[PDB]
Design a protein around this ligand. Structure first.
Ligand SMILES: O=S([O-])[O-]
Ligand SMILES: O=S([O-])[O-]
Ligand SMILES: O=S([O-])[O-]
Ligand SMILES: O=S([O-])[O-]
Lengths: 220, 222, 220, 219
């Protein structure tokens, strides 16, 4: 019966505009929803080479891939087969601001992802337009309900070249397609995201994420 | 520096496309204005996505700082950006987490400004004034203009008046970029705005918009 | 009914702590409430020389000194003789954060100001700790009521060396001592504050402010 | 060396919130290497407090955090001479607090000189109306910025009626002694609890458990 299979495929299509530069990126990947692990091969179809740091895009490339323990409601696995969508804001400390959307549907063993990404006001001398980012640091997303909608806030950080950090405040709203999907209580989701490999211009990127839901101390 | 080919009476042509809270929309604008008086009007028509499920007011500042009265002692970046034109990018951070970005690519052919506008909004709560259409108007605002990381930047602390005498705060940051080289950057200055929906139909599928803008140096000389 | 005189004396006592550094500063001044003008001689009694930019303190050194038109309700002049108090948050773009308070009273022809100022998290190499500020730019405070309390918001900026700018978001809450003082509608107050003179270490400072309330365009 | 498995905690807080002055004393014990501590708090001046006691609780020492061997422990290495911190708390409704603690150590006791100031809390907000229940368990993101160890938290207060009240916190940590090695980026999980209190929160028992870690997949 279950909509969620142990091994699932990921189909993704992103179109976006950062600082006036339009781009199209396709992703094709696989994942283990119950283990909270997924990997995806990304290919820039339009707008390559990207004039900005690829890292700002990577969290937009599905919380269904997160290990949820029995005592926390899994809103995301409960949202299928119909699916769910999310909206996100990324507020960077130097004034750069991004919003993103993803409409997530499923057919058989495959998730389909319609993603949009727009970023503005990144300074020319900043780490994003200078491509000085190395990776996102491991984060902890704070999950809670606000105005009937499941919300996730993260104090995120990009590691820069020269071992400095670049801060980003992330807010995501998650909405199931189907009515009656039970909202979860407050909890946390640990994230770890990594670009495993890329070509020189990041026209081709292999991406990996691991995520685990928990209740924080002392339950750990 | 050079003659802008900006005439005292200009036409305005505008297509906006956007998505707020998952809802796609296309809106056209046709207007007229007096750049040196800092005044403009425009009739807006929702072409796709009507009727909008959100407050039309959030879009109205996206619907050109050429239409601003600049005194002789403050550099006018925008009129000097023409004939070639300029583009802007904006972030709108509302107090309840709603966040919008917007851009506009502005060009000029003869007597007409052309505006390619894009508007994207996320995270507006369902029972907030935006999704509930509980806004009345923008209050008159004052944009702070300064050069930030080598780019002219406008920061506004704005307020939407709500039904029930309450206000709804929005912080906006706009970055302005001339297309042609050699455009002198201005020093710090202020721009007073007053934007107003003069009339609309019930669903805001048709809207008449008006703006009055005046640049000044603040106290004591203003 | 007012007892606010066209010419008023100003007595001020500030104590505070920025970056762990405690200080006491006294002010002696005069002003013209109905012209919206005031000046003040400031003297650092303890904590001198200040290791931070004096400019961050200057807005803490009374909206009584603002020219209000008849068509705008003057909360501040109406708050006397009993007086009023304000609290303020100053949020700087590099994470430095200040709070301040002033309890304002009137005895005869003199205003007494009990001021407190605390600032934290200023970067060692930012313009505040490095004293790279030149002046506050003239500003426009947005006045409006929030939760039954008069509130003013400012998109403020410090001019720096080289004519760069350092942004500060200022929120003040204004509370009359007497109950029932009628709240004003939305309006603006233009400000221009200046250090007219000072000694090398800013132990002695002559300060000036001009403020004028208005309705914004098209009226002003 | 400097820090014992069992330690005493002596604390004085003096502060002002919404114009209301207060003095709170604290006495407690903790196990630094287990990252646990308890404290009996007494409001000496300003009782009963007209605001939610919860907003003060994180002001009442990252010495009390379990640091694993693979992460530099700036705090335990800061002793015997000690360290200070400054903090901003930015609440979602405009309320803003700053706080400071100078932490010293003589013998088996920590000494804490705490100051706390809060402004712009709305009269019908959860803080002034005392509608908070607790802080939710949190994760502090630790990193260096401009030569100084810095911790950011997206924290939440649980309210009556099951809603939440968001607070963004930034703490700057500074060793008294020079040359203390800065750690690399890491995380600190927190759980803070009022164990017991009287009706007016004049007396409060407070508990914190905290554990440093490297995040997924190494935690
Ligand atoms: O083994 S995970 O780093 O791709
Ligand atoms: O296990 S402690 O949170 O009562
Ligand atoms: O700025 S002063 O000279 O009025
Ligand atoms: O002319 S006024 O109504 O904006």
């Amino acid at each position: 019966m279950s909509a969620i299979k142990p091994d699932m495929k990921i189909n993704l299509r992103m179109e976006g505009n950062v600082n006036g530069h339009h781009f199209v990126i396709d992703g094709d990947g696989t994942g283990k929803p119950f283990e909270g692990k997924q990997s995806m091969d990304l290919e820039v179809k339009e707008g390559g080479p990207l004039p900005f740091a690829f890292d700002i895009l990577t969290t937009a490339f599905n919380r269904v891939f997160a290990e949820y323990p029995d005592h926390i409601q899994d809103y995301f696995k409960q949202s299928f087969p119909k699916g769910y969508s999310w909206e996100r804001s990324l507020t960077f400390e130097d004034g750069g601001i991004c919003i993103a959307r993803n409409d997530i549907t499923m057919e058989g063993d495959t998730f389909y992802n319609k993603v949009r990404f727009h970023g503005v006001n990144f300074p020319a001398n900043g780490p994003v337009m200078q491509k000085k980012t190395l990776k996102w640091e491991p984060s902890t997303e704070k999950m809670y309900v606000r105005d009937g909608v499941l919300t996730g806030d993260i104090t995120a950080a990009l590691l820069l070249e020269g071992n400095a950090h670049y801060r980003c405040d992330s807010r995501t709203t998650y909405k199931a397609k189907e009515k009656g999907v039970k909202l979860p209580g407050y909890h946390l989701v640990d994230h770890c995201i990594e670009i495993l490999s890329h070509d020189k211009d990041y026209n081709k990127v292999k991406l990996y994420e691991h995520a685990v839901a928990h209740s924080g101390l002392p339950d750990n």
